[PDB]
Design a protein around this ligand. Structure first.
Ligand SMILES: [Mg+2]
Ligand SMILES: [Mg+2]
Ligand SMILES: [Mg+2]
Ligand SMILES: [Mg+2]
Ligand SMILES: [Mg+2]
Ligand SMILES: [Mg+2]
Length: 224
RNA sequence: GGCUGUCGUCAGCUCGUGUUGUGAAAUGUUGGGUUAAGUCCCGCAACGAGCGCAACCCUUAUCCUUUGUUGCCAGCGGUCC
């Protein structure tokens, strides 16, 4: 990544001054038009070091998970995870995914069974009434947990967009002792994150830049 | 002990794991619609399950296949009708 490359993507833009958490005063360069500006000169090295640690942990062959739930970036996180060979969650995070995994395993199994029934030639003996509810259940289950259908255990690293919106996941990770790699805007609390990446978290361009950089770095980490 | 009345055939009553609180406890079971119904859908720190509601049981209302006695008489013949 480069300062020139990411300055054109509008990363430095933050939120309104009325909303800034004081927990990240150092990360703010200044203000303009009553809107904060994020400092590039420090967000570059921390991002690079996070990427280094990330592909280092990837080379150990460790599964990782991408949390991004805004309706404007579900497609981007899905694309990164798919062309990453790694996993994702792109809808409402069901509380207790990590800390209550021994229960969500059952829903994973049910989704697998129902997918086999659907794409195995079974949804024709049903009397056009319960087949529809089976399809409805399929759609709900895949939209809620389709990106984690093959954990086979807890992950190792958990990557989050907009740490503030995803406090449940960060708390899950802190409870279970799993490192967190998150992007925080000028209104979040970075205490639960041990690898803080300052910057915007809602603009599509910045989100795409983050996801592309992470997907690349982890591909070269896996190829190692 | 067993059996029965009653609230009341009212729509409610709970549990496992997770989270919150020093604790008694809370959540789920709250919210928007909807229903005869905690009935269903959408949201959601909750994710699921059990007993209840509904369906499976008996009867009544239409049609068809089979058998025609002690039951029936449309078309035939006779008749004390
Ligand atoms: Mg406690
Ligand atoms: Mg509450
Ligand atoms: Mg209650
Ligand atoms: Mg309660
Ligand atoms: Mg409701
Ligand atoms: Mg029910």
């Amino acid at each position: 990544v480069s300062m020139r490359d990411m300055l054109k993507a509008g990363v430095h833009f933050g939120h309104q001054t009325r909303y800034w958490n004081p927990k990240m005063k150092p990360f703010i360069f200044g203000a303009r038009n009553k809107v904060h500006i994020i400092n590039l000169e420090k967000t570059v090295p921390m991002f690079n070091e996070a990427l280094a640690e990330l592909n280092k942990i990837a080379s150990r062959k460790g599964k990782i998970l991408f949390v991004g739930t805004k309706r404007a970036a579900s497609e981007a996180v899905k694309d990164a995870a798919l062309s990453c060979d790694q996993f994702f969650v792109n809808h409402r995070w069901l509380g207790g995914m990590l800390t209550n995994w021994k229960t969500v395993r059952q829903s994973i199994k049910r989704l697998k069974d129902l997918e086999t029934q659907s794409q195995d030639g079974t949804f024709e003996k049903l009397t056009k009434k319960e087949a529809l509810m089976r399809t409805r259940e399929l759609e709900k289950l895949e939209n809620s947990l389709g990106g984690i259908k093959d954990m086979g255990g807890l992950p190792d690293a958990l990557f989050v967009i907009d740490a503030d919106h995803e406090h449940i996941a960060i708390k899950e990770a802190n409870n279970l002792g799993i490192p967190v790699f998150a992007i925080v805007d000028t209104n979040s609390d970075p205490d639960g994150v041990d690898f803080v990446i300052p910057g915007n978290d809602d603009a599509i361009r910045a989100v795409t830049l983050y996801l592309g950089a992470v997907a690349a770095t982890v591909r070269e980490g896996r190829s190692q």
